[PDB]
Amino acid sequence: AARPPEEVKAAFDDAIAARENEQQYIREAEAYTNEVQPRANGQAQRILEEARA
């Protein structure tokens, strides 16, 4: 075995967790987009109906 010391092992684990968090941020951004767009569509329909009225 050629493991690095424990102190830097913590940093190695942090780097792997950083990769996972990097993926998670993009996932949340796509979530925000998919959430926000339908609300815009609904507001557009609402203002169109208000104009008709």
Binding site: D13, D14, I16, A17, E20
Partner: peptide, 30 residues
């Protein structure tokens, strides 16, 4: 019919099967 000294055949041992039971991640990665 030469037997390498670092082989298990140099000893009286024969390995018939090697398998992995479970592969886990460190608790931070998990």
């Amino acid at each position: 019919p030469v037997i390498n000294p670092n082989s298990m055949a140099a000893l009286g041992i024969e390995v018939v099967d090697v398998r992995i039971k479970q592969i886990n991640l460190p608790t931070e990665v998990s």
